Design a protein around this ligand. Structure first.
Ligand SMILES: CC(C)CCC[C@@H](C)CCC[C@@H](C)CCC[C@@H](C)CCOC[C@@H](CO[C@@H]1O[C@H](CO)[C@@H](O)[C@H](O)[C@H]1O[C@H]1O[C@H](CO[C@@H]2O[C@H](CO)[C@H](O)[C@H](O)[C@H]2O)[C@@H](O)[C@H](O)[C@@H]1O)OCC[C@H](C)CCC[C@H](C)CCC[C@H](C)CCCC(C)C
Ligand SMILES: CC(C)CCC[C@@H](C)CCC[C@@H](C)CCC[C@@H](C)CCOC[C@@H](CO[C@@H]1O[C@H](CO)[C@@H](O)[C@H](O)[C@H]1O[C@H]1O[C@H](CO[C@@H]2O[C@H](CO)[C@H](O)[C@H](O)[C@H]2O)[C@@H](O)[C@H](O)[C@@H]1O)OCC[C@H](C)CCC[C@H](C)CCC[C@H](C)CCCC(C)C
Ligand SMILES: CC(C)CCC[C@@H](C)CCC[C@@H](C)CCC[C@@H](C)CCOC[C@@H](CO[C@@H]1O[C@H](CO)[C@@H](O)[C@H](O)[C@H]1O[C@H]1O[C@H](CO[C@@H]2O[C@H](CO)[C@H](O)[C@H](O)[C@H]2O)[C@@H](O)[C@H](O)[C@@H]1O)OCC[C@H](C)CCC[C@H](C)CCC[C@H](C)CCCC(C)C
Ligand SMILES: CC(C)CCC[C@@H](C)CCC[C@@H](C)CCC[C@@H](C)CCOC[C@@H](COP(=O)([O-])OC[C@H](O)COP(=O)([O-])O)OCC[C@H](C)CCC[C@H](C)CCC[C@H](C)CCCC(C)C
Ligand SMILES: CC(C)CCC[C@@H](C)CCC[C@@H](C)CCC[C@@H](C)CCOC[C@@H](COP(=O)([O-])OC[C@H](O)COP(=O)([O-])O)OCC[C@H](C)CCC[C@H](C)CCC[C@H](C)CCCC(C)C
Ligand SMILES: CC(C)CCC[C@@H](C)CCC[C@@H](C)CCC[C@@H](C)CCOC[C@@H](COP(=O)([O-])OC[C@H](O)COP(=O)([O-])O)OCC[C@H](C)CCC[C@H](C)CCC[C@H](C)CCCC(C)C
Ligand SMILES: CC(C)CCC[C@@H](C)CCC[C@@H](C)CCC[C@@H](C)CCOC[C@@H](COP(=O)([O-])OC[C@H](O)COP(=O)([O-])O)OCC[C@H](C)CCC[C@H](C)CCC[C@H](C)CCCC(C)C
Ligand SMILES: CC(C)CCC[C@@H](C)CCC[C@@H](C)CCC[C@@H](C)CCOC[C@@H](COP(=O)([O-])OC[C@H](O)COP(=O)([O-])O)OCC[C@H](C)CCC[C@H](C)CCC[C@H](C)CCCC(C)C
Ligand SMILES: *C\C=C(C)/C=C/C=C(C)/C=C/C1=C(C)CCCC1(C)C
Ligand SMILES: *C\C=C(C)/C=C/C=C(C)/C=C/C1=C(C)CCCC1(C)C
Ligand SMILES: *C\C=C(C)/C=C/C=C(C)/C=C/C1=C(C)CCCC1(C)C
Lengths: 227, 227, 227
């Protein structure tokens, strides 16, 4: 159930909000129309995660789903967060590496499915079926990382050294971080309960703040984002 | 509860639908690819408000939320309306003043949060917490008006006189109208019941029709929208 | 109720998934940045329909709505599908014929309403009112077909012969297919039960696979999609 993890949600909520503040109060005197963009996408990610973590802390983003043979505590807010948050992150990588609108659209449709499917997977009452949805979502995810790692890196080799290198850093970080989510989900309170909801939230809190604030920090503090 | 306000919802529904008709049957012989755009965004706002007001009149957009210590009548349809309607309005101002894609994205993310947060605020069961959400939403809103008023106006000074002036009119109107919503909400049936749901709907009906039809009229009837 | 149509949903789910696979494993060695786009939009349509059909087969996309004087089986998943699927289809026609951003935005707002209204129509408890929503949705739809048929065709006459002709084929197909949905809906289990949910699903399954996979096949297998 949901109560003892309140602390990881409260600390997650705080780091998001400050993460939003620092990024906001940093990109104010930025005139470069490109940087101005990078700040917008990057600043919006924590602003969203903030509202959603806060909803979990206040107990709104928590619902109870019956499966297996019991009433399970499912934090749906996570997906309302990820749904807009993951695409924005993808967009940061795309502008940086200057991706084709056709590939951006594909990655954005791949992503929406990943979360959409992951949300359905978290609310399905037939315990067994949840894993079917987990599969479809993890497949979609790999598609995204295959393109980010191989496809994008290729597009990064035609940009100036600052960009190619910052992209490299960002690329390694998303690929490692992203693949943690599905594992955490599979062993958490949405799949096979091998790990308590207590620790699960402590894990998703580290994985999030790193992917949202961490990632923003790496990028925003480089010159890779200028013309 | 919801019944005695049926008349403000029925008259709101009518003004929206006619508002859609007049704008539609006005921009038909428009060839200018820019005006053609302004009509599209501007015409869609009332078309949406129509469907949503109609849902309130038909009782679908009304739900009952328990808080404080009673069952409260909450018209959720408003946000399903605003969520797409406010961003479109923002887009009208942006094309007019020729804003950066980075600022448009920021204002659109600021807006989505404002309504998203406002929706959560209207459905939260812990009476006290509703105001927390009200705060976050009103903060987001001010961000939007700060940019519209100071930021955009600045971008309007480099456009031809017709545009700068029409923008001025539009700018004053949105800033005054927008700031009424949060006040109406705070004193209405979603916050502290100082005002009955009866009058509340009469207020939101004036504020809406003015912001959607009124605003469209001001703009659409000027030459500010041409090349 | 929902059980005997499981077979049309299972066969629909399969044709979607394979439809996704074939399109995916076809557009891999495509370098043309335009084709690369057409594949993205076109490939995403079946990928979405897949997830949604699967949700119906697994029973998640089915809900029970009380109206008339009974409990009715309503597959809401259809609209979660159509909402993103129809706009993508519209986008295929638009890029092909090179439409104005103002018209694309109008058709996309027209479409969102059509499904949005159609969804409301399927969940409204006042039997009679459902038809009101059906009307608004069918009106929106005609608007879309009026533009596709007359407006777009006009834009197609200034493209090379391969495009104008492929567009013609695509145009006839969408206009005939699209207009079947509202009729099927009116006589199905969402309106007047003249037809059993059994056959209704067999009809929507043919109409979908044709509109999504069929349409993609026609387009994707022509050179109309290259520069
Ligand atoms: C413009 C765009 C193009 C924007 C589109 C935005 C929109 C479509 C995003 C949707 C995102 C999705 C992923 C989230 C939905 C998940 C869905 C499955 C969950 C839905 O449930 C929550 C929903 C409704 O809340 C409820 O109100 C109903 C009506 O009154 C009730 O019937 C429900 O029951 C009620 O649910 C709540 O309460 C339940 C309580 O039950 C009780 O529990 C207590 C516990 O102590 C006790 O046991 C009681 O006895 C028992 O009864 C609880 O269980 C439920 O979980 C729930 O709390 O909420 C609406 C959420 C809102 C939509 C979130 C928005 C997210 C943020 C703000 C988005 C910011 C986005 C912008 C758009 C991004 C910009 C970037 C772009 C430019 C790219
Ligand atoms: C393409 C894009 C990128 C598009 C995305 C669009 C989408 C994500 C927008 C979502 C917008 C959000 C903000 C609205 C959701 C708010 C949410 C909290 C409220 C959800 O509830 C409503 C929902 C479901 O209705 C219900 O069906 C369920 C399943 O069958 C039931 O379990 C629910 O209970 C039921 O809820 C209804 O009935 C309740 C009745 O209870 C009873 O009351 C009576 C009273 O007399 C009596 O007491 C009974 O005894 C008692 O039981 C009632 O209380 C509930 O309130 C409710 O009526 O509805 C779906 C709504 C649909 C999604 C609205 C769409 C809006 C319009 C058409 C959008 C047009 C948008 C286009 C996309 C814009 C284009 C522009 C772009 C280009 C920028
Ligand atoms: C980034 C974008 C800009 C993306 C935005 C995406 C988002 C906004 C799309 C929304 C689309 C809309 C149209 C779908 C919503 C329809 C709505 C009316 C229906 C909502 O209900 C379903 C929802 C919640 O499920 C439920 O969880 C709640 C919380 O725990 C519960 O309170 C609910 O009751 C529960 O509902 C389920 O279970 C019910 C069961 O009742 C029982 O029935 C059994 C039967 O045997 C028995 O009788 C039991 O006794 C009885 O109690 C059942 O009746 C309900 O129907 C339901 O199953 O589900 C969330 C769905 C999720 C949002 C779908 C996503 C769709 C896909 C994956 C989208 C891919 C999109 C990308 C974004 C496209 C990319 C292209 C762009 C670039 C253009
Ligand atoms: C604890 C908190 C997390 C809780 C708060 C609630 C929160 C959840 C809601 C907040 C809304 C949030 C979504 C906003 C995100 C904004 C972010 C995406 C912005 C990124 O930034 C993008 C820029 C767009 O730039 P421009 O205005 O167009 O400048 C043009 C210039 O003239 C150069 O032109 P040239 O190119 O031709 O040379 O934002 C515009 C730049 C502006 C001109 C300057 C704005 C300054 C700010 C108003 C002040 C900084 C913020 C404050 C310290 C406090 C934050 C609270 C918030 C509510 C305002
Ligand atoms: C009471 C009502 C509110 C209830 C109704 C239900 C309602 C909720 C649903 C309605 C759908 C609604 C969302 C539609 C909004 C549309 C709006 C955004 C349109 C704005 O307008 C944008 C234009 C796009 O223009 P184009 O076609 O591409 O023209 C190109 C030309 O050749 C010049 O080219 P050049 O630049 O190279 O020189 O719409 C295309 C222009 C067309 C070519 C002309 C269209 C004419 C109309 C079909 C007729 C006018 C409407 C009718 C009187 C009745 C309205 C009912 C509605 C259902 C159709
Ligand atoms: C700086 C930030 C970082 C920190 C701040 C953000 C966060 C902490 C929250 C701020 C919001 C908070 C001030 C909202 C107040 C609502 C609260 C008093 C409601 C109590 O609800 C209980 C009612 C019972 O009313 P009954 O129906 O007659 O019985 O008490 C009776 C209540 C009275 C009727 C209320 C009188 C209040 C006003 C004098 C009413 C007049 C309207 C205001 C002038 C309009 C806008 C003001 C806005 C700036 C607060
Ligand atoms: C049964 C199934 C339906 C169930 C599966 C679950 C499913 C629901 C979820 C799947 C996700 C799905 C949404 C993905 C849709 C993708 C689709 C829209 C893609 C359309 O395609 C768009 C391209 C973008 O191209 P690029 O990478 O940018 O190439 C640039 C080149 O260098 C030329 O540059 P130049 O222009 O300058 O000359 O996708 C990128 C091209 C890549 C570089 C090549 C990718 C190859 C694929 C990874 C392998 C093909 C797929 C596999 C056989 C199996 C499919 C399973 C799926 C999970 C991966
Ligand atoms: C101009 C606009 C501004 C104003 C108009 C818009 C708005 C007012 C609404 C218009 C929609 C309205 C005409 C819909 C009719 C459905 C209604 C009769 C349903 C009654 O539901 C009750 C059923 C009981 O059926 P049971 O299962 O056998 O028991 O009565 C038995 C019902 C019968 C079985 C129905 C026979 C009807 C048709 C002859 C069936 C044949 C199909 C049609 C040819 C297909 C499309 C027609 C479309 C244009 C209406
Ligand atoms: C908030 C930032 C990031 C980096 C979020 C990423 C989220 C995912 C990669 C989620 C993936 C999932 C999978 C692959 C399996 C089903 C459940 C998840 C949605 C958690
Ligand atoms: C339909 C047109 C307009 C101009 C709608 C504007 C809506 C807002 C500015 C809503 C603001 C809110 C705040 C600031 C506080 C919480 C509740 C609201 C969503 C009503
Ligand atoms: C999946 C592909 C297509 C071509 C889907 C098209 C869907 C429609 C044209 C739906 C139209 C409806 C109307 C006009 C009436 C109310 C109910 C519907 C949503 C089925």
């Amino acid at each position: 159930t949901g109560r003892p993890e309140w602390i990881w949600l409260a600390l997650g909520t705080a780091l998001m909000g400050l993460g939003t503040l620092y990024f906001l109060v940093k990109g104010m005197g930025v005139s470069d129309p490109d940087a101005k963009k990078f700040y917008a996408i990057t600043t919006l990610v924590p602003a969203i995660a903030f509202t959603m973590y806060l909803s979990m802390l206040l107990g709104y983003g928590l619902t109870m789903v019956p499966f297996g043979g019991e009433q399970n505590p499912i934090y749906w807010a996570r997906y309302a967060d990820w749904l807009f948050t993951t695409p924005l992150l993808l967009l940061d990588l795309a502008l940086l590496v200057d991706a084709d609108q056709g590939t951006i659209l594909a990655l954005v449709g791949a992503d929406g499915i990943m979360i959409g499917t992951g949300l359905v997977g978290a609310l399905t009452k037939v315990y067994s079926y949840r894993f079917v949805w987990w599969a479809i979502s993890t497949a979609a995810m790999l598609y995204i990382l295959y393109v980010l790692f191989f496809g994008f890196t290729s597009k990064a080799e035609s940009m100036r050294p600052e960009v190619a290198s910052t992209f490299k850093v960002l690329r390694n970080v998303t690929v490692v971080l992203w693949s943690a989510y599905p594992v955490v989900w599979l062993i958490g309170s949405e799949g096979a309960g091998i790990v308590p909801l207590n620790i699960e939230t402590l894990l998703f809190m580290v994985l999030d703040v790193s992917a949202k604030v961490g990632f923003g920090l790496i990028l925003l503090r480089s010159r890779a984002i200028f013309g």
